A paper describes a structure:
Against this background, we solve the crystal structures of avapritinib in complex with wild-type and mutant PDGFRA and stem cell factor receptor (KIT), which provide evidence and understanding of inhibitor binding and lead to the identification of a sub-pocket (Gα-pocket).
A single modification by ethylation did not affect the potency significantly since the IC50 values were almost the same as for avapritinib. However, a reduction between 1.7- and 3.5-fold in potency was observed in the cellular experiments.
Residue numbers in the entry: 566 to 693, 762 to 818, 821 to 932
């Protein structure tokens, strides 16, 4: 075996990213969990030699175990390998010596899309600071372009959902939280023990712990249902129990949201094909949505 796939998480950390810890000033917590949090911060001298830039910083709690610390470094290495794209939350820097790992990313001033949609739900009108159908179509397109970029780098995200899409200036949407993202060299078999986002998962991920380009596409379909339902929770009135799994396996699928264009519901249904081989690729989804936007003009 003289040729092999280069595993981005095995490469050394590139100190071109290194930024002095003592030039980061922490502000409000943006998200938190059992062993970590993300905070807003000011980064003095990060980009502009004399000026401060608002960023986000991901970090573990002091009590975090070694497994969680290695997982944060692995995410930093995946982000370092991926490179830059308009529709992802980009890596800006890292702190690795003098203390625990801090990962510095772009800050998105409007927060996550799910809360944004729920806030805008009452002041939404399909046609024209109100949310409209043109905005929803734009968000669908931008998330599809970000995901096409990830797949073009042979990566899967594994937690695509409206809560992991952020909104920033100019109505630009960015995919965030690469904690579970993987380079898949043709699938990934999760051997972990964590809580899982069951209602966003492809059947083959639930039943066989298998993740692929095609299971990210399933989750994108669920994201589209969240988007055009203005932030409803998927499968309303259905607990995650034995009846849920049985229904999904037999072919049950959600109905169209009221405000989804028929051609966007069509994409949703193909993303949810029981056969992963019949689902569209993100490259095909981008081309589809592009034509819808052009015909909408
Ligand atoms: C599965 C959960 N794991 C953890 C718990 C985790 C943390 C550290 C660890 F070491 C390990 C795990 C986690 C938690 N939270 C995120 N988030 C938060 C949101 N976040 C943002 N990123 C950039 N800008 N930004 C702006 C806003 C915002 C909100 N309101 N407004 C007006 C603006 C929010 C963000 C990215 C992801 N991720 C991970």
């Amino acid at each position: 075996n003289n040729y092999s796939y280069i595993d981005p998480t095995q490469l050394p950390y590139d100190h071109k990213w290194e930024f002095p810890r003592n030039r980061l000033s922490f502000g409000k917590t943006l998200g938190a969990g059992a062993f970590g949090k993300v905070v807003e911060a000011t980064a003095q001298g990060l980009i502009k030699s004399d000026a401060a830039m608002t960023v986000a910083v991901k970090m573990l709690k002091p009590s975090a175990h070694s497994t969680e610390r290695e997982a944060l470094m692995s995410e930093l290495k995946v982000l370092s390998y991926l490179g830059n794209h308009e529709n992802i939350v980009n890596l800006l820097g890292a702190c690795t010596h003098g203390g625990p790992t801090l990962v510095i990313t772009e800050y998105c001033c409007y927060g996550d899309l799910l809360n944004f949609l729920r806030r805008k739900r009452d002041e939404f009108v399909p046609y024209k600071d109100f949310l409209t159908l043109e905005h929803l179509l734009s968000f669908s397109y931008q998330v599809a372009k970000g995901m096409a970029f990830l797949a073009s780098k042979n990566c899967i995200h594994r937690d695509l959902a409206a809560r992991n899409i952020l909104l920033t200036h100019g109505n630009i949407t960015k995919i965030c939280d690469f904690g579970l993202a993987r380079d898949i060299k043709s699938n990934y078999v999760d051997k972990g023990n964590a809580r899982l986002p069951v209602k966003w998962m492809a059947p083959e991920s639930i039943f066989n712990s298998v993740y692929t380009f095609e299971s990210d596409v399933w989750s994108y379909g669920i994201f589209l249902w969240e988007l055009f339902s203005l932030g409803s929770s998927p499968y309303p009135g259905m607990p995650v129990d034995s009846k849920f799994y049985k229904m999904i396996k037999e072919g049950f699928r959600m109905s169209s949201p009221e405000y989804a264009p028929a051609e966007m519901y069509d994409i949703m249904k193909t993303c949810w094909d029981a056969d992963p081989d019949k689902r569209p690729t993100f490259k095909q989804i981008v081309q589809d949505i592009e034509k819808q936007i052009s015909e909408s003009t």
